[PDB]
């Protein structure tokens, strides 16, 4: 899987 | 923008 | 295809 | 992973 | 939006 | 292209 950094604002790590 | 539902686990709305 | 929820106004199901 | 409502016809929750 | 490190050469933070 | 952080082991920068 890969880690995406998206704003939830605050940036969060998002694993996909 | 579009709303994606991803697990952060708990599902969260993610707007893109 | 899939249903994306995107602003189009209002957020609607959109066929992608 | 993120969930997408995609035709698989029936529309199925698909987990990418 | 999500941030991607993409070449634009210099690698730039790009906000999709 | 961009740098994705993906499991490949370890999570490394990956050119996408």
Residue D8: both structure tokens together: 């698989």
Q: Distance (Å, rounded) from C-alpha C8 to C-alpha C6?
A: 6
Please list every residue in chain C whose beta carbon sits closer than 8 Å to the beta carbon of residue D14: 2
Resolution (A): 2.1
Q: What is the DSSP letter of D10?
A: -
* DSSP alpha helix (H) spans, chain E: none
CA dihedral C12, D1, D6, D12 (to 10 degrees): -110
- Which chains are within 8 Å of C by 3+ CB pairs? B, D
In three-state form (DSSP H/G/I as H, E/B as E, the rest C), the secondary structure along chain A is: CEEEEEECCCEEEEEC
Which residues in chain B have their CB less than 8 angstroms from residue A12's CB?
8
């Amino acid at each position: 899987a890969c880690v995406f950094f998206c704003e939830d604002a605050a940036i969060i790590g998002l694993a996909v």
